Write a protein that binds this ligand. Structure first.
Ligand code: ZN
Lengths: 68, 117
């Protein structure tokens, strides 16, 4: 059957090259500094980092929002 | 000790202990369950190798250095299809962290003593 409204194209989620490398910072010595925050929730305790948006941080696993 | 490393990682993947990937390695190191890790060299990795080495050197983990990525993929054995010889499509890998509960192996004991001494 013919249509009038054009079909709603699916969301093409873009890829990120070496997205893991954007969490920490590179130093020549044997020390670690973490850039973004980490979710203090129960299921994701100390391994899963949080999002870094333009106005608030977010974790999707437990739906935790940290507004400014 | 390379054969000890390959056997212990095969046991780890059999026992569903190890993790593979930069994201998985970071998760294991942050969860403080990591025991060993591997890293490749001579690649277009300006800050990748420095980042993972600092992660590995943060607190009490063993480091293994290798050259090639697809060879490391052969070391872990993720594409064992076409068993009658060479795997048809070898995949590459750089960072693999070994967490093992079935460490009752002479290979594990030898590599642990090698890192300790
Ligand atoms: Zn969370």
């Amino acid at each position: 059957k013919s249509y009038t409204t054009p079909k709603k194209n699916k969301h093409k989620r873009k890829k990120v090259k070496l997205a893991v490398l954007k969490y920490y910072k590179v130093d020549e010595n044997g020390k670690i500094s973490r850039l973004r925050r980490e979710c203090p929730s129960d299921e994701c305790g100390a391994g899963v980092f949080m999002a870094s948006h333009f106005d608030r941080h977010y974790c999707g696993k437990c739906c935790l929002t940290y507004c400014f | 000790v390379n054969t000890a490393l390959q056997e212990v990682l095969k046991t780890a993947l059999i026992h569903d202990g190890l993790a593979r990937g930069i994201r998985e390695a970071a998760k294991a190191l942050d969860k403080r369950q990591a025991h060993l890790c591997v890293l490749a060299s001579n690649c277009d990795e300006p800050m990748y190798v420095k980042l993972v080495e600092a992660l590995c050197a943060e607190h009490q983990i063993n480091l293994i250095k290798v050259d090639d990525n697809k060879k490391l993929g052969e070391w872990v054995g993720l594409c064992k299809i076409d068993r009658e010889g060479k795997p048809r499509k070898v995949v590459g890998c750089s960072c693999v962290v070994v967490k093992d509960y079935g460490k009752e192996s002479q290979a594990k004991d030898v590599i642990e003593e090698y890192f300790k001494c």
